[PDB]
Amino acid sequence: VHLTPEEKSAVTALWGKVNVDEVGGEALGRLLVVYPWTQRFFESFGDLSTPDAVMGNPKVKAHGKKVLGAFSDGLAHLDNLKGTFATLSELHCDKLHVDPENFRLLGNVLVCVLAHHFGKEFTPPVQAAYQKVVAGVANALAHKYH
Amino acid sequence: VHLTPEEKSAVTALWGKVNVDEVGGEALGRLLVVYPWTQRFFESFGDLSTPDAVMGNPKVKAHGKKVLGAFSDGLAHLDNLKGTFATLSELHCDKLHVDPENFRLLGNVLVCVLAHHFGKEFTPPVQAAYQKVVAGVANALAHKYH
Amino acid sequence: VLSPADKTNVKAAWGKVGAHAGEYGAEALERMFLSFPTTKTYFPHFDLSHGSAQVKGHGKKVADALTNAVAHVDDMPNALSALSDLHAHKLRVDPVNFKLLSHCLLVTLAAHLPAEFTPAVHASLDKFLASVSTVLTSKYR
Amino acid sequence: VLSPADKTNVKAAWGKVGAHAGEYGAEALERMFLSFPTTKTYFPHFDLSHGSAQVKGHGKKVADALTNAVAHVDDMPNALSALSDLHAHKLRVDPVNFKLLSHCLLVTLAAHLPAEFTPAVHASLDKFLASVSTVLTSKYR
Ligand code: HEM
Ligand code: HEM
Ligand code: HEM
Ligand code: HEM
């Protein structure tokens, strides 16, 4: 993504303060609750009949953590999101059969999570940068789909 | 856009047969009728109160030609839709204040005009190629918005 | 909301389709798969090659639903309620894809109804397809 | 459709907003302009600088419409018909931007209501804003 240098500096500054363990579990959980059709892909994660069932789900919690990890790494390579996520893009398509639209839903929910978390510190300009990143990521992930 | 050679081949090969005069008028025209809100920008065109008022509107038919002509030229530099559309990008943004989503709507309308007119000759594969094009353009045309 | 003119327009267009509907269903899907590869994510269990009988079959099924939607234009909700449950509770197809097929269905129609695919019809069909889409995704959450 | 729970969640969430809805509307507007610059295309005539009183002002307005939408949750169609006519007929704002403003509102609410911005409340408010958006662009054609 073509992020200003203060965009990448701001994205970066904040990320350092995020607790990946948790944020990821919170982001993925909120996805499943807000857009329940996304649950289609996690039938083996057990109970997701309720918000508490979803948010406290240890599997959701565990999955959430791997996502954010991968996300974290893409952030070390803003200049090469596509190379970064190339293997994950093929997997999601060819093996997981996940519609790329889910990547966009997740990036927005993630933005709501970060906002939820940094409060006043998550300013308009910080958000603007974050949107760009999330979009870079969903596009990077949807790139090898065919 | 990532066009296949048979992709450029077929794009280029169908366009060759296009009468830009009426395909151009018919596409802008249909845009105004199908997505009434787009008219916002052509109040100066007159009476658009009807499908007929619009279709046979010469101010529409003439703008349509210009648009198709410019589109028609981006086909010559597939390899750099952004350089091509750079100035038209800034104009539509800064002067016309046109929302880039309109460009996306036109592209779809355009694919419909082409299918209408070429019929059996506008094959799935051919539509596919064009979808890529209309997308590229939309994108190239929205690229300098700020 | 469909005006009485839209309804006329669509009843008209669709009556023209007649016995090809099925033909046209399968065609629109085909176009979709090739033009919007992402849409294939939902048919991992189908043969998607050109000529696929699975695709032909399903095409009919889709067509038949459109026909039915046409017949009950004034009570689409009721007529389609059951498909709404299915796409909402089982298929769980991201709402975005409805716009894709509607466009593919529209292109198809235009390629087979030179004469009838008028600006006014075009506009009425778009609206009818968007209403069907709206119905099918009304039970998502 | 908003369920009894959605309505509860939203009446409460909005309740909380309270005296800041102006402040919030404005802030969400700033968020939207920065994140989705194409949105500025509808406000050529405005001062879109940080602090603009023109933005603050309009933000109040947007907020008061939402408060009023919340106030008439069981009859949103009628409660906002005036604004639907307006957006549909005079402004002619592309339907896709309603989703962006909504996202920004959510983001502003989340930033400000830590305690209340619960998964369940988030889902409810998301549904509400989507319903508002639906009302507002219902007369586009
Ligand atoms: C922000 C973008 C995303 C990232 C970085 C990401 C990352 C990952 C990673 C690292 C894995 C495990 C790799 C492996 O097992 O080989 C995975 C698996 C998976 N991803 Fe994603 N993912 C993303 C978005 C999504 C979304 C939005 C969905 C659907 C809502 C999804 C559905 C899945 C599924 C279903 C699996 C396998 C889960 C299972 O173990 O059953 N992914 N993803
Ligand atoms: C492929 C997409 C498009 C192309 C290639 C295109 C091209 C052009 C060109 C060449 C001009 C004249 C500017 C000049 O050279 O001085 C123009 C002007 C304009 N365009 Fe577009 N355009 C596109 C889409 C749209 C859409 C979708 C809309 C809104 C519905 C729009 C609204 C306008 C308006 C209002 C003008 C000014 C007309 C006048 O008063 O002279 N354009 N466009
Ligand atoms: C207005 C648009 C649509 C109509 C009329 C429609 C109609 C139908 C019908 C009639 C069925 C078969 C159910 C049965 O046998 O009772 C079906 C199932 C299905 N639909 Fe749709 N659908 C639409 C949109 C979509 C979209 C956009 C997608 C995804 C790209 C989709 C994915 C599916 C799938 C995957 C099935 C399962 C069929 C099978 O597994 O054999 N549908 N739909
Ligand atoms: C939930 C969504 C929305 C609500 C509740 C809303 C509400 C309003 C209200 C209350 C007014 C002013 C009417 C008056 O002065 O009586 C207005 C005007 C306006 N709205 Fe919206 N609106 C929404 C979405 C949008 C979107 C998405 C855009 C474009 C991005 C937009 C652009 C405008 C503009 C340009 C004006 C006129 C500005 C002025 O001259 O002061 N609105 N809207």
B99: exposed, middle or buried (Cβ count in 10 Å: 0-12, 13-18, 19+): buried
Residue B78 distance to chain D (closest CA, Å): 25
Atom of ligand 1 nearest to the CA of A32: 30
Q: Which residue, chain included where needed, has tokens 């509102």? A: D105
Range of the domain at C85: 1-141
A102 in contact with ligand 1, CB cutoff 6 A: yes
A54 touches chain C (CB under 8 A): no
| CA-wise closest residue to B35 among D86, D98, C123 | C123
- Collect all residues from C whose CB is shorter than 8 A from any CB in B: 27, 30-31, 34-36, 103, 106-108, 110-112, 114, 117-120, 122-123, 126
CB atoms A93 and C41 under 8 Å: yes
| CA nearest to D141 within chain B | B36
Among the bound ligands, the one closest to the CA of D132: 4
CB atoms B30 and C122 under 8 Å: yes
| CA nearest to A132 within chain D | D35
Residues 6+ apart with CB under 8 A from D14: D21, D66, D67, D70
Q: Which residue, chain included where needed, has tokens 């979709």? A: C32
CATH value at residue D70: 1.10.490.10
Cβ atoms of residues C109 and C13 within 8 Å: yes
Among the bound ligands, the one closest to the CA of C22: 3
* Interface size between A and D, measured as CB pairs under 8 A: 56
Encode C114-140: b = buried (16+ Cβ within 10 Å), e = exposed: eebbbbbbbbbbbbbbebbbebbbeeb
Terminal Cα-to-Cα distance of chain C (whole angstroms):
22
D141 vs B contacts (CB less than 8 Å):
35-36
The CA–CA distances, whole Å, from C119 to A5, A91, B33, C103 equal 48, 43, 7, 15
D123 touches chain C (CB under 8 A): yes
d(CA D42, CA B98): 8
Task: For chains A and B, tell me whether 3 or more CB atom pairs sit within 8 A of each other.
Answer: no
The CA–CA distances, whole Å, from B15 to A70, B63, B73, C115, C117 equal 44, 19, 11, 22, 21
Terminal Cα-to-Cα distance of chain D (whole angstroms):
22
Q: Which domains does chain A possess?
A: 1-146 (1.10.490.10)
B37 vs D contacts (CB less than 8 Å):
88, 92-94, 140
D122 touches chain C (CB under 8 A): no
Cβ atoms of residues A28 and A67 within 8 Å: yes
C1 vs D contacts (CB less than 8 Å):
138
Return the half-sphere exposure (C-beta side, CA atoms, 13 A cut-off) of residue B47. 4
D93 vs B contacts (CB less than 8 Å):
37
- Compute how many other C-beta atoms are within 10 angstroms of the C-beta atom of residue A120: 8
The radius of gyration of chain B from alpha carbons, rounded to an integer in Å, stands at 15
Cβ atoms of residues A69 and A84 within 8 Å: no
Domain count, chain D: 1
D127 touches chain C (CB under 8 A): yes
Which ranges in D37-95 belong to alpha helices (H)?
Answer: 53-71, 76-79, 81-86
DSSP H or E segment with residue D9 = helix D4-17
Q: Which residue, chain included where needed, has tokens 């300098």? A: B144
Name which residue sits closest to atom 39 of ligand 2, judged by CA.
B63
Name which residue sits closest to atom 6 of ligand 4, judged by CA.
D62
Is D87 annotated to bind ligand? yes
Resolution of the experimental structure, in angstroms = 2.1
Cβ atoms of residues B22 and B28 within 8 Å: no
